[PDB]
Design a protein around this ligand. Structure first.
Ligand code: NPO
Length: 261
């Protein structure tokens, strides 16, 4: 009787696949509200309203770096907006404001009859993702908006690592050999600061700073985990509890931690 459960029962194979069960379409945002540019990905056949996820790139970067998440997540039953920031050189606090503005605009479009996502979104169920400074921005978003249902930043950085205010379920993807935002001074301290949430830390063996970006060679695992985390926590969908919470016990993972999951 979970009103938010969508799609067939998951399997490892179905979550590792390039595409989930639903057909995906996309469109460009005509007039971004409070951010630079956006692409919205959505399922055409999810069978009920779905939650929305906003995804932000890192410093200097654009939608291309994070775009693979759009179809991957949308095909499992989410509306996903990938953004460009107002400036490629925006810092994490500005990136958080823009991420939240993008979620607001998804809500606007859900109420706009000419939009392809008209009536497709449950605006009460939202999540945040992003790379590097965009990952820091996602954590700021979560700290400031505790009704967000999930966060899953990748290779995050912020000038502070104290995210003890975050009560939103948070999965941190990290990249072992990150030279930009080293794990030991960025992703791991951030993970360790969070005391009141379901949380997880998944470090990719040998990964550079771009190890969770479009074109990575761990899309099966990373995509399984991101989808599972969003499903479990955005949809309250306990079919995904093991996928969300498990240690993959994988040679592709150099460090795994989880708590309250
Ligand atoms: O953009 N970032 O991910 C950064 C920026 C500066 C820094 O010293 C470390 C990481």
């Amino acid at each position: 009787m979970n009103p938010y459960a969508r799609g067939p029962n998951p399997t490892a194979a179905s979550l590792e696949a390039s595409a989930g069960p639903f057909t995906v379409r996309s469109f460009t945002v005509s007039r971004p509200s409070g951010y630079g540019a956006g692409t919205v990905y959505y399922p055409t056949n999810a069978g009920g309203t779905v939650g929305a996820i906003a995804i932000v790139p890192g410093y200097t970067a654009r939608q291309s770096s994070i775009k693979w998440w759009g179809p991957r997540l949308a095909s499992h039953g989410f509306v996903v907006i990938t953004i460009d920031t107002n400036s490629t050189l925006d810092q994490p606090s500005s990136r958080s404001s823009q991420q939240m503005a993008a979620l607001g605009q998804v809500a606007s479009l859900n109420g706009t009859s000419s939009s392809p996502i008209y009536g497709k979104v449950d605006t009460a169920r939202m999540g945040v993702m992003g790379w590097a400074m965009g990952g820091g921005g996602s954590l700021i978003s979560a700290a400031n908006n505790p009704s967000l249902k999930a966060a899953a930043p990748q290779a995050p950085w912020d000038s502070s690592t104290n995210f003890s205010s975050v009560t939103v379920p948070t999965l941190i993807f990290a990249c072992e050999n990150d030279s930009i935002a080293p794990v030991n001074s960025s992703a791991l301290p951030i993970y360790d600061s969070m005391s009141r949430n379901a949380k997880q830390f998944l470090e990719i063996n040998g990964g550079s700073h771009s190890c969770a970006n479009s074109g990575n060679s761990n899309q099966a695992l990373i995509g399984k985990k991101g989808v599972a985390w969003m499903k479990r926590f955005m949809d309250n969908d306990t079919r995904y509890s093991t996928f969300a919470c498990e240690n993959p016990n994988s040679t592709r993972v150099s460090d795994f931690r989880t708590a309250n999951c």
